[PDB]
Design a protein around this ligand. Structure first.
Ligand SMILES: [Fe+3]
Ligand SMILES: [Fe+3]
Ligand SMILES: [O-]
Ligand SMILES: [O-]
Ligand SMILES: [Zn+2]
Ligand SMILES: [Zn+2]
Lengths: 318, 318
């Protein structure tokens, strides 16, 4: 009935139009060490975050899942500022991006238990002293592999999901390990109706998707607008793939997002001009002003789109 | 003539008795993500740090190099608190512990330049807004290898040393890559009189040490008290090895320390009883109350010990 947001418990029936995967802040692990040239501008960042939020609100978005990992600059108090300003629901995550802190604890023998303990504290007690609980557990695997280290988190996550009924959301690397992630989680008693396999758009083969869908998990095409980088496919290939699945009747299992980074942590940078032009549509409005349109031209009805944007998040969190 | 400390420039001739490698705070990268169960207790930590400092002061220690990497909880303002309290000189570092933040910048093409730029800013301008400059560049290599990623830092470091005359201090993993580190740095124009190859005590073969010494670099036996873990040797093996070198007349090239972690960042823990007893002498007084004694029984004169503790740091920083 309720999900934890950065503003406390919210009835699931009120989440409405939802983006399943967007980052207000994000930094790659290691950004912390580059503090001197990469200082966090809090009032400017807040401004950008608020803008991004209003943009979503313009297209009816009432709720956003921000799955920024604990080691990637997750900042629940800052996200609470955004929500307090805009009235946007924001659900944050507990999890790590895809050693040696946990490598050390593996030596101690307590690593998997420590991770489970972290997930439980952050799901049921609160993150640091923010009084904010995460609503999702965030997981990530490597290219072509779910490593022993990663499986620790997958096992801790499954155990925490049993206890809390929390949602698991995952990162797949370069369109691999979708079926493996779903199978491994189910092995350990996770509930498929509470799992989103992420970055599934990274793979263009519909068989791979169906293989994953057969587990009864949600899949996310959540990188709309990312092109020419991280071995990613084109938006055209995304739509093609998404079209095969929808025509095949899979709409109760699919959600869409952009995986935007609205504020980058660490040292500012500028993408080179080959990369730069390709990434031009990577922003929180893209789904609504480009993708959803082309989908309609391909005959996707509104009941379906609503299933993805409203029905599916509502099923997922309830 | 001067070195930058956490309290500003200090004449090198006043550094006096010096420990070349000790950590007031340290956390393994990733500790940041474990904030909920691993919150930093600032006033308690300060208390412990101050105690540790006074302990060093009891044995005449006037100066300490704290080479905690940027991504391991380096906190210059906190170290400045310690120095202001105790009058201890503390020299801090710029560097990273032994991706994907810098992996990403490698993609951008700016990684090595960004690292050099960081070293220059932190050596000559200041760390974040603390107004503290690092006095050393800290480097680290992997077991049996200096990876392409690591060489980036080694190259950036050599370039920064040319410009600034700063000291380089290194981490070797499990007694490997000593000669390789010295050779690679010298290749790129680094000054051997400004280089300390660290953790050299990790290797028990005196030939390996002599091989490294032949470059004219300093070597550090800086893990006195660490036993039974990290593939480490015994203190007895350390002393044996150190004895061969001193008898061979190498005292102008050797320094000693414990590589202590006085406050651990991240989640508290307790070492298991096998490990625990092994590690019992791992504290900042060990050199002075156990090692230096046994050295005298083996006939090490005080002129020599002074060369290591006073003359060598004085040569190194001048
Ligand atoms: Fe993401
Ligand atoms: Fe160290
Ligand atoms: O991501
Ligand atoms: O270390
Ligand atoms: Zn991801
Ligand atoms: Zn080290």
């Amino acid at each position: 009935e309720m999900v934890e947001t950065v503003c406390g418990p919210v009835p699931v029936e009120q989440l409405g139009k939802t983006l399943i995967h967007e980052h207000f802040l994000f930094g790659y692990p290691g950004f912390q060490g580059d503090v001197t040239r990469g200082t966090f501008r809090e009032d400017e960042s807040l401004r950008v975050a608020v803008e991004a939020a209003e943009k979503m609100k313009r297209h009816g978005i009432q709720t956003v899942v921000d799955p920024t990992p604990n080691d990637c600059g997750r900042n629940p108090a800052f996200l609470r500022r955004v929500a307090e300003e805009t009235g946007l629901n924001i659900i944050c995550a507990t999890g790590y991006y895809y050693p040696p802190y946990f490598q050390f604890r593996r030596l101690l023998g307590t690593a998997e238990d420590d991770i489970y303990d972290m997930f439980m504290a952050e799901l049921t007690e609160g993150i640091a002293d923010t009084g904010i609980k995460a609503g999702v557990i965030k997981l990530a695997s490597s290219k072509g592999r779910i490593t022993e280290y990663e499986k620790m988190f997958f096992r801790a996550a499954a155990r925490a999901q049993k206890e809390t009924g929390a949602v698991i959301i995952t990162h797949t690397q370069e369109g691999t390990m979708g079926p493996e992630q779903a199978a491994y989680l189910l092995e350990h008693g996770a509930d498929p109706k509470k799992i989103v396999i992420g970055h599934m758009c990274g793979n263009t083969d519909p068989d791979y998707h169906r293989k994953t869908l057969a587990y009864g998990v949600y899949i996310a095409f959540d990188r709309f607008g990312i092109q020419g980088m991280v071995g990613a496919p084109t938006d055209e290939e995304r739509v093609r793939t998404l079209l095969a699945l929808l025509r095949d009747g899979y709409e109760k299992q699919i959600m869409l997002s952009h995986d935007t980074v609205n504020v980058w942590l660490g040292r500012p940078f500028t993408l080179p001009e080959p990369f730069a032009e390709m990434m031009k549509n990577w922003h929180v409005e893209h789904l609504f002003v480009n993708i959803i349109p082309a989908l309609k031209n391909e005959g996707i009805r509104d009941e379906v789109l609503e299933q993805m944007f409203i029905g599916n998040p509502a099923a997922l969190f309830s």
